[PDB]
Amino acid sequence: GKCRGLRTARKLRSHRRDQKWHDKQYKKAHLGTALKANPFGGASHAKGIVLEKVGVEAKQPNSAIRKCVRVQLIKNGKKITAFVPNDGCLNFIEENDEVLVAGFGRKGHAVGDIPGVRFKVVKVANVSLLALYKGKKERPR
Amino acid sequence: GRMHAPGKGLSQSALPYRRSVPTWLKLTSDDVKEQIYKLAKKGLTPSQIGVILRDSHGVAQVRFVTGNKILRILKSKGLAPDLPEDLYHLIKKAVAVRKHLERNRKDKDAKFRLILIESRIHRLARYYKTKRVLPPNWKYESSTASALV
Amino acid sequence: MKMQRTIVIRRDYLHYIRKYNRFEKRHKNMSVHLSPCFRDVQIGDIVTVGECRPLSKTVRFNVLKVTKAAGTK
Amino acid sequence: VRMNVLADALKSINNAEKRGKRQVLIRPCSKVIVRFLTVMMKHGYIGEFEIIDDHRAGKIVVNLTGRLNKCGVISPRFDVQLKDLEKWQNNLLPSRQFGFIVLTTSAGIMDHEEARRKHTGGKILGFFF
Amino acid sequence: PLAKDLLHPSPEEEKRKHKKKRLVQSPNSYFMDVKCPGCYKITTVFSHAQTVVLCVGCSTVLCQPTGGKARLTEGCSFRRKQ
RNA sequence: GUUUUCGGAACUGAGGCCAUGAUUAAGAGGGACGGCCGGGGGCAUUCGUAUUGCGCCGCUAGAGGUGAAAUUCUUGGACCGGCGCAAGACGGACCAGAGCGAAAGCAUUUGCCAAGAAUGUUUUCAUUAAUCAAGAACGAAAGUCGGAGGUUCGAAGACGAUCAGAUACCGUCGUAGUUCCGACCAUAAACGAUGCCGACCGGCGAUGCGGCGGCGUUAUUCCCAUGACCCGCCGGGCAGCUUCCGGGAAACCAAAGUCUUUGGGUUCCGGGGGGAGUAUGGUUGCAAAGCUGAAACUUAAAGGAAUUGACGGAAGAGCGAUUUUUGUACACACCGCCCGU
RNA sequence: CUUUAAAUCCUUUAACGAGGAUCCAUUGGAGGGCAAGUCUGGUGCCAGCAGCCGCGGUAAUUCCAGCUCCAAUAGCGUAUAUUAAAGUUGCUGCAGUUAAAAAGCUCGUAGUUGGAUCUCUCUCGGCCGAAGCGUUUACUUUGAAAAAA
Numbered sequence A: 001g002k003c004r005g006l007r008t009a010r011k012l013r014s015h016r017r018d019q020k021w022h023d024k025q026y027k028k029a030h031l032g033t034a035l036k037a038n039p040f041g042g043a044s045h046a047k048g049i050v051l052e053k054v055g056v057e058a059k060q061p062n063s064a065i066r067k068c069v070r071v072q073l074i075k076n077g078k079k080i081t082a083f084v085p086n087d088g089c090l091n092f093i094e095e096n097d098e099v100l101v102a103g104f105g106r107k108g109h110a111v112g113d114i115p116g117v118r119f120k121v122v123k124v125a126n127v128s129l130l131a132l133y134k135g136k137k138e139r140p141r
Numbered sequence B: 001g002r003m004h005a006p007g008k009g010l011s012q013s014a015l016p017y018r019r020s021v022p023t024w025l026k027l028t029s030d031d032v033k034e035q036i037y038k039l040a041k042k043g044l045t046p047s048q049i050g051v052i053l054r055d056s057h058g059v060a061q062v063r064f065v066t067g068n069k070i071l072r073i074l075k076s077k078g079l080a081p082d083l084p085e086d087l088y089h090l091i092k093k094a095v096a097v098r099k100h101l102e103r104n105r106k107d108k109d110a111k112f113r114l115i116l117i118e119s120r121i122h123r124l125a126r127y128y129k130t131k132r133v134l135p136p137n138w139k140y141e142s143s144t145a146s147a148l149v
Numbered sequence C: 001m002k003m004q005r006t007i008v009i010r011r012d013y014l015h016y017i018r019k020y021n022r023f024e025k026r027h028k029n030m031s032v033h034l035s036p037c038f039r040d041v042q043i044g045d046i047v048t049v050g051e052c053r054p055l056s057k058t059v060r061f062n063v064l065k066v067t068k069a070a071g072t073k
Numbered sequence D: 001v002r003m004n005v006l007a008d009a010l011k012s013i014n015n016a017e018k019r020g021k022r023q024v025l026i027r028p029c030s031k032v033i034v035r036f037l038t039v040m041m042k043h044g045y046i047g048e049f050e051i052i053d054d055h056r057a058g059k060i061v062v063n064l065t066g067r068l069n070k071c072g073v074i075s076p077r078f079d080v081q082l083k084d085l086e087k088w089q090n091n092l093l094p095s096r097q098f099g100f101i102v103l104t105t106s107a108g109i110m111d112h113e114e115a116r117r118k119h120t121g122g123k124i125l126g127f128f129f
Numbered sequence E: 001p002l003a004k005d006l007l008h009p010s011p012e013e014e015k016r017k018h019k020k021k022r023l024v025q026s027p028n029s030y031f032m033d034v035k036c037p038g039c040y041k042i043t044t045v046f047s048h049a050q051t052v053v054l055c056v057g058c059s060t061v062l063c064q065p066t067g068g069k070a071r072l073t074e075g076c077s078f079r080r081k082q
Numbered sequence F: 001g002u003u004u005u006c007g008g009a010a011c012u013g014a015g016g017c018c019a020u021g022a023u024u025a026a027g028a029g030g031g032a033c034g035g036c037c038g039g040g041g042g043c044a045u046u047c048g049u050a051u052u053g054c055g056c057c058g059c060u061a062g063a064g065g066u067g068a069a070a071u072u073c074u075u076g077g078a079c080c081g082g083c084g085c086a087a088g089a090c091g092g093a094c095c096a097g098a099g100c101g102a103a104a105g106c107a108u109u110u111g112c113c114a115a116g117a118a119u120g121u122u123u124u125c126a127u128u129a130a131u132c133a134a135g136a137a138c139g140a141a142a143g144u145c146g147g148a149g150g151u152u153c154g155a156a157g158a159c160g161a162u163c164a165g166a167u168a169c170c171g172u173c174g175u176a177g178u179u180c181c182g183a184c185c186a187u188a189a190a191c192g193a194u195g196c197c198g199a200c201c202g203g204c205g206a207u208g209c210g211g212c213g214g215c216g217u218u219a220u221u222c223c224c225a226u227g228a229c230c231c232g233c234c235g236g237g238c239a240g241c242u243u244c245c246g247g248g249a250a251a252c253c254a255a256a257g258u259c260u261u262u263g264g265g266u267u268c269c270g271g272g273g274g275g276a277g278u279a280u281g282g283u284u285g286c287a288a289a290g291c292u293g294a295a296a297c298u299u300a301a302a303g304g305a306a307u308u309g310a311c312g313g314a315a316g317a318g319c320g321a322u323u324u325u326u327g328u329a330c331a332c333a334c335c336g337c338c339c340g341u
Numbered sequence G: 001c002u003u004u005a006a007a008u009c010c011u012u013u014a015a016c017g018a019g020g021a022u023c024c025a026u027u028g029g030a031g032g033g034c035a036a037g038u039c040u041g042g043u044g045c046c047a048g049c050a051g052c053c054g055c056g057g058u059a060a061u062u063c064c065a066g067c068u069c070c071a072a073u074a075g076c077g078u079a080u081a082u083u084a085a086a087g088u089u090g091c092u093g094c095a096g097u098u099a100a101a102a103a104g105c106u107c108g109u110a111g112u113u114g115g116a117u118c119u120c121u122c123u124c125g126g127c128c129g130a131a132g133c134g135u136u137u138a139c140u141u142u143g144a145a146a147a148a149a
């Protein structure tokens, strides 16, 4: 049982402080290894240069080819696989282009069939993919 | 339960409700005190004196008759041992176990029991230091133990 | 009592932790100046000290009264 | 070892009340226990009790009326200010129409309402309802 | 069960309990006056004696200690006190 | 100017006087004492068959081993029967839901040495107590280093079988080891998978120890008294049956109860499944290894109890699904599931 | 005109100024969680959607569209840090037989916790004034001092 003495405040506080480290999220947030390993460095978005176009096979029981791009970030130079979400939006991206990339929605965890992909493309060549998809803006060229 | 055993016995004494000396007892306080002095001079601890008085002279409780305890009577007279009897018995038992153990090196149970006995000795010595019955430098050492008792 | 004309005393207290509604034991050490007028001062007796100007690097109090321990005979 | 006597007495009373017994024997006695039982009896929860006097710490025989739902002790005895009493009332009592918190104040051992009337704080001992 | 007068146990109830578990503690022992046939002196003996009791006048063994009670020598008579 | 008034401080003597000054002895704990109790511990001593080997004697061609055989030993007398001798290891039956020990663990007789629980107590002390960072003693088996012995068994190994294949299961040998002494090692499903101290809360019948009481049978040729039975009571102990005490997901538990009616004291310890008790640092060890002990990354479940089926080289009541025995990690239901190269 | 250093804006006021009052409201959704269509046309485990469960392999309530329908509204989606939800860090208030879990066992220092009991004062000065109080604390109730925002 727990100690209920009137002078046990140090014991209780010390025990709680030491047992908080067995929480996955607390340790992840306060240890610093996750922040060091995070390619974004704690940012919501980033800018990169499209190295190339790749196709990732969807995990079973689904069968598909998800269109992604390999890009390299400008601030740290790390290489990243980002997802281009829409029907035919991969034709809006060219090689050596500059793209804005955001997270996939699960805080560094993979989403859906796509294995090991945690980033998605937002803007290409300084125009949003939504505007290109809906035909509101054209590629600068 | 016991301090150093799992046993949880209940055997002990139950003093009567009445504190008045029974009518049949013809002894006075002075006669009881003289008997206590003679027994102490014979070389008996207060526990043995109380046992003898209970068994032979019909003295159920000296504190009820004389109004005082055996050890306090001895201290007032001056016939009291330097160190308390229970600590003396503990040290004597430790000495006996240590004398046995030196001739029997493979007796691990003797070593365990000696550790327990010395722990009890340390407890009692610390308690007696707190009450200033012992000087605040008295120490139990195995070599000195034989000479102490 | 090992320095020349200055001793080390200990002050004990309890610190309150609001979250748990409880206390923890804490202590502080003070180096104080002891005048030669106070003799027969032993370890473990109560001392009443008063504040003065800094007498040295770590001494700011002076012994004003000495009261013996409970075991005095 | 036994370190709280009021806790044992209240636990024994509660266990005997759950079983439908008519009387409870609690030992050892204590004047704190007597004050707590007097506070309970003034509100009609227990009834008359008798103190058996042996030459060592005494005993109590308590009559039961069947009106007691729960009697308990609070350990440790926390200091309660007069402005923090409503929080303990919300935490421990079942309703705002019945139930009492027992406090030891400098005026004596009483309930929380009597401590509000006399405008004093103290230390919480237990509760009953 | 659910109805028992704890204040007023029967006299047989309190002699069946353990000596410490009674309402008020009371020992199970007693003192007795013993007389040996050889010598006329009356000796007071505790029932649960732990020492051999010798007659002062004539050095006769009045009793022998055992585990629970002390057994009197053959031919010795005893009477309880009070 | 002296001393004495007055005032302040210190040291000596018997006085009077106090109701003269010690609360109780915990169904708390220590320490005495009494009769017992126990495969508890150490040392020495003693006995018992059995197994192996050796010596001699008798008659003999087989013996051993297996599902079946072979490797193996045998007219240089095997196996079997008898009479002795020697060594080493183990104490059968009695032996039990019995006892002791802190746990590992503990069983031939006798003696010595120290230790202990429980019971009995109108003995003594008077709070001396509970749990415990640091720090310590002990700690199965296996393993390591020196000595002594090496009967049996026997990792490794050599063979003979089986098999599609066996590097396994089976059989013949057989090295470390298994045994004792002295130093290390500190690990077990080291388990009741259940920390210790204290209080309360239903019945029943046994059982081990101590004590108390009581008709009656037996032995000590008589008498008490003490042993063996019988009927009860009390206190600790190992357990059992029963119960709508109450708990819990249930299995089940008189504790795993007295928990949203949530607080008796205190120690250790868990936070979805893997990576992983792995890497690295520190520390201990002769070594083997022991203690402390991550992260990157990966994943939507893994897991507990119970139910209905299907399989098997097995014989009114429950929260609820639900209402021949049994096991299941199967439910696309053994044509299953699943592990490692 | 007023406003103001001078202006601008707001307010006050002439004249003009609304029928498709075209002087046009958007952002996300329509399987469940969660409000709202197994309506029609394409595609056919492709393209794609989908925080999660899942949808799509020729009759797709989920993709691409049309129609219709929901939610908030001059606002509405997305990524990330953080709070509640979390009684999933538990002091209030969690667990440790079998789901993750009690050290192999014992001793023991520090720490934590600890059985009953016990119903203002002389003197000096003008009833109060000075002086000693309290064996001292903890507690509780007062009072004083405590920057604004």
Ligand SMILES: [Mg+2]
Residues within 6 Å of the ligand: A061, A062, A063
């Ligand atoms: Mg699919």
Ligand SMILES: [Mg+2]
Residues within 6 Å of the ligand: B002, B003, B004
């Ligand atoms: Mg202990």
Ligand SMILES: [Mg+2]
Residues within 6 Å of the ligand: B011, B012
């Ligand atoms: Mg005893």
Ligand SMILES: [Mg+2]
Residues within 6 Å of the ligand: C018, C019, C020, C021, G091
């Ligand atoms: Mg709080």
Ligand SMILES: [Mg+2]
Residues within 6 Å of the ligand: none
């Ligand atoms: Mg022996």
Ligand SMILES: [Mg+2]
Residues within 6 Å of the ligand: none
């Ligand atoms: Mg032969």
Ligand SMILES: [Mg+2]
Residues within 6 Å of the ligand: none
């Ligand atoms: Mg035991």
Ligand SMILES: [Mg+2]
Residues within 6 Å of the ligand: F091, F108
């Ligand atoms: Mg035998």
Ligand SMILES: [Mg+2]
Residues within 6 Å of the ligand: none
């Ligand atoms: Mg340790």
Ligand SMILES: [Mg+2]
Residues within 6 Å of the ligand: none
């Ligand atoms: Mg071993």
Ligand SMILES: [Mg+2]
Residues within 6 Å of the ligand: none
């Ligand atoms: Mg070995």
Ligand SMILES: [Mg+2]
Residues within 6 Å of the ligand: none
């Ligand atoms: Mg060797």
Ligand SMILES: [Mg+2]
Residues within 6 Å of the ligand: none
């Ligand atoms: Mg073999």
Ligand SMILES: [Mg+2]
Residues within 6 Å of the ligand: none
């Ligand atoms: Mg062999």
Ligand SMILES: [Mg+2]
Residues within 6 Å of the ligand: none
């Ligand atoms: Mg282990």
Ligand SMILES: [Mg+2]
Residues within 6 Å of the ligand: F191
């Ligand atoms: Mg087991």
